[PDB]
């Protein structure tokens, strides 16, 4: 309770280009306030929170032998930089 | 054959079997006594995978089932297992004692 | 509840009927009237000390009000 962390980067393709020049996209604690995004963002990666937007998605179509389901809840949020800093290794990475 | 058991890694005899030739009990569960005596398996003529040689057929088959194995063997083979008399300050020593004896002392051998 | 009495309980039941008589007169009982009903008292009041009420119910009332009249 108060363990700041609240996310998992958007290893997502399309989301790549943004990482590429100025914005970055990730999966975030389905719940964090957008200002929550700004803070986790800022103190976490020592940056400059710019433009913080959000989207959400649940799962559809998972057949399980004799019964079925479709998954849980994956949350999406995108935040941009001010200069183009931080996330380096992550980005060079994927 | 329950939450409780017989010998462990131990080294014992096969009565009603096909081998009798006792030896290293590589592993023995808690509930299904499931124990492998490394005394009779097969090949599972493997996947056809490169998992086993790209030209496979697994070798060491050894899941030991039946429980007619005569666990424990001191200078004596088929014997049940005693319990204790403690003898020393804080002494469980549920070692195995009957006729000959074996307790699997933490030394020279299991 | 919201209409029993105030000075005890007088709020309930009643099974009854009739038909007709003519017994130790000339015969048996013209017997029958399988009926059901209510059955109760009335309301009224006085004053604590400048500004009041009572509410209550009938008799129990009269004696009572007399009582707290005593105070």
């Amino acid at each position: 309770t108060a363990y700041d962390v609240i996310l998992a980067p958007v290893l997502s393709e399309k989301a790549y280009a943004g990482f590429a020049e100025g914005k970055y996209t990730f999966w975030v604690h389905p719940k964090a306030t957008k200002t929550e995004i700004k803070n986790a963002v800022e103190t976490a990666f020592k940056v400059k929170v710019v433009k913080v937007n959000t989207l959400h998605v649940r799962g559809k179509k998972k057949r399980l032998g004799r019964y079925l389901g479709k998954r849980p809840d994956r949350k999406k949020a995108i935040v941009q930089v001010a200069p183009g800093q931080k996330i380096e290794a992550l980005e060079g990475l994927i | 054959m329950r939450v409780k058991m017989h010998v462990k890694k131990g080294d014992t005899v096969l009565v009603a079997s096909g081998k009798y030739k006792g030896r290293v009990g590589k592993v023995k569960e808690v509930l299904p006594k499931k124990y492998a005596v490394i005394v009779e398996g097969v090949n599972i003529v493997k996947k056809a995978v490169r998992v086993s040689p790209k030209y496979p057929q697994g070798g060491f088959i050894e899941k030991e089932a039946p429980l007619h194995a005569s666990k424990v063997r001191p200078i004596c083979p088929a014997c049940g297992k005693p319990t204790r008399v403690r003898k020393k300050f804080l002494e469980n020593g549920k070692k195995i004692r009957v006729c000959a004896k074996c307790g699997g002392a933490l030394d020279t051998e299991e | 509840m919201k209409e029993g009495i105030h000075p005890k309980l007088v709020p309930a039941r009643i099974i009854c009927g009739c038909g007709n008589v003519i017994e130790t007169y000339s015969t048996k009982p013209e017997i029958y009237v399988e009926v059901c009903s209510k059955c109760h008292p009335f309301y009224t009041g006085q004053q604590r000390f400048v500004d009041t009420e009572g509410r209550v119910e009938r008799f129990q009332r009269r004696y009572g009000d007399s009582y707290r009249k005593g105070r």
């Binding site: 309770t1 363990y3 700041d4 962390v5 290893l11 | - | -």
Partner: protein, 67 residues
Amino acid sequence: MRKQLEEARKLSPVELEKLVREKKRELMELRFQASIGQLSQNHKIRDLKRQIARLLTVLNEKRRQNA
């Protein structure tokens, strides 16, 4: 790491505070890892979580003792 049980015993307010916080961050590191080293990681994840968990068990014990 019963030993860690010990360190635990050892620290207090702001201490345990930033300890568990930073450690937590560490596990974040893990979260990140969700697609790199991985193999020997496993444990950093499960255990690390158990660890920090303890961290909290303690804070509770101590400040609870308090108020």
